């Protein structure tokens, strides 16, 4: 009972530590997601709703299950009520409930760690919200950045030193790539980058791939 739950905790923590790292930070235009990802087609960052983004670290099929569940929840909520009623907070809230249930009841706990991010609606001024949901369902509201997966502490402290509010997109991308390298070369071939762009009219999520990303890395 007490070491069974601690064994589940250690299995999940080990699984999250063995995966590559992800960073989400608030910049002047919204939220930047930067994850170490060598794959061309398998994604760790994703759109959830109009102004709500998703980032995960850990076992792919498990955080992909939760990614799909989040999109299902968000779309169902926006249809049953109205699009504007969907918030990043309630998406993090249901992620915390779901991971809590999984951690206690499923055969194996999920070796995953989630970030839910929300930017302001178009034309409205509101600081980005960042939420972290760990494998046990614990939920944390962060103001500036979230680091997930692998050796997190060196990346967290690199951001602790070099992060500045309202930085440009290029400045934020440099800081994020540098902080990731502190935790472990990283180029367009090994990066998955996307933003929640608060200047988009409806759907804020957009990926930065290939030529555009290379241009912002120089």
């Amino acid at each position: 009972m007490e070491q069974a739950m601690r064994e589940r905790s250690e299995l999940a923590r080990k699984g999250i530590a063995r995966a590559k790292s992800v960073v989400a930070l608030a910049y002047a235009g919204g939220v930047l997601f930067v994850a170490e990802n060598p794959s061309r087609s398998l994604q760790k960052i994703s759109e959830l709703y109009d102004r709500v983004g998703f980032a995960a670290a850990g076992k792919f099929n498990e955080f992909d299950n939760l990614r799909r569940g989040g999109i299902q929840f968000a779309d169902t909520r926006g249809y049953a009520y109205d699009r504007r009623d969907v918030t990043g907070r309630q998406l993090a809230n249901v992620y915390a409930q779901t991971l809590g249930t999984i951690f206690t009841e499923q055969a194996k706990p999920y070796e995953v760690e989630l970030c839910v991010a929300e930017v302001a609606h178009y034309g409205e001024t509101k600081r980005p919200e960042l939420y972290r949901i760990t494998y046990d369902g614990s939920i944390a509201d962060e103001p500036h950045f979230v680091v997930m997966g692998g050796t997190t502490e060196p990346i967290a402290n690199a951001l602790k030193e070099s992060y500045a509010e309202n930085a440009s997109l290029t400045d934020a991308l440099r800081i994020a790539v540098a902080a990731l390298r502190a935790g472990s070369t990283l180029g367009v071939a090994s990066l998955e980058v996307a933003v929640l762009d608060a200047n988009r009219p409806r759907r804020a999520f957009r990926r930065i791939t290939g030529s555009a990303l290379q241009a912002l890395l120089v």
Partner: protein, 222 residues
């Protein structure tokens, strides 16, 4: 039944009559048909009494249920949708004579221009919803007479008081032509009810004000 709603600069007014009938027989003189659904919304319902009352009661509970579960009230569009879904779910019973036809008035606290943040949404028995854009609407067996009266009277609407006066006069014209809509009852001192909503929220209009306006209309037309 006649229930009216109209926009005025910075708010919205909803007013409704007090009559219930069972055929040709008058079965009610005191019915309250306009409900403060939440702090910024009023609902008025025509149709079968049992269903209309249940709709108003259930809708208010649903709105507050969301606000307490989620810490924030629904957007006004979400409120529209939930009422439409309620009406749509009643369609089969409505075809069997258990009809509820609502009219929704509100003040959107998230609209950009507060001077025009008032909202009026009409519905049909299939759950259709239409946000009105011409400033007024009505529902019930007297709604045609009230809408045509308001068409000629709406130019007089400049503030809450004149919006209330026009609303009461429309209900008077509806009862003048529709025996299923109750006029002002001077013998018993029973008058239409009204709710007015602005940026400070929804409030019931005191009966004395509606009495004043009703007597003025009667005095004028004599």
């Amino acid at each position: 039944t006649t229930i009216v709603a109209l926009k005025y600069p910075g708010g919205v007014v909803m007013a409704g009559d007090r009559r219930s009938t069972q055929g040709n027989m008058i079965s009610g003189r005191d019915v309250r048909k306009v409900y403060i659904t939440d702090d910024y919304t009023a609902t008025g319902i025509a149709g079968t009494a049992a269903v209309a009352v249940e709709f108003a009661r259930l809708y208010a509970v649903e709105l507050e249920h969301y606000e307490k579960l989620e810490g924030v009230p629904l957007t006004f569009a979400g409120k529209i949708n939930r009422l439409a879904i309620m009406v749509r779910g009643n369609l089969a019973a409505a075809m069997q004579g258990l009809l509820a036809l609502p009219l929704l008035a509100g003040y959107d606290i998230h609209a950009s221009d507060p001077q025009s943040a008032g909202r009026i949404v009409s519905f049909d028995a299939a759950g259709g919803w239409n946000i009105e854009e011409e400033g007024y609407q009505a529902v019930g067996s007297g709604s045609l007479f009230a809408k045509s009266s308001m068409k000629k009277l709406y130019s007089q609407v400049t503030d809450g008081d004149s919006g209330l006066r026009v609303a009461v006069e429309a209900l008077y014209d509806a009862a003048d032509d529709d025996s299923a809509t109750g006029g002002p009852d001077l013998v018993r001192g029973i008058f239409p009810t009204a709710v007015i909503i602005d940026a400070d929220g929804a409030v019931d209009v005191p009966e004395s004000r509606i009495a004043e306006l009703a007597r003025a209309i009667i005095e004028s037309r004599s």
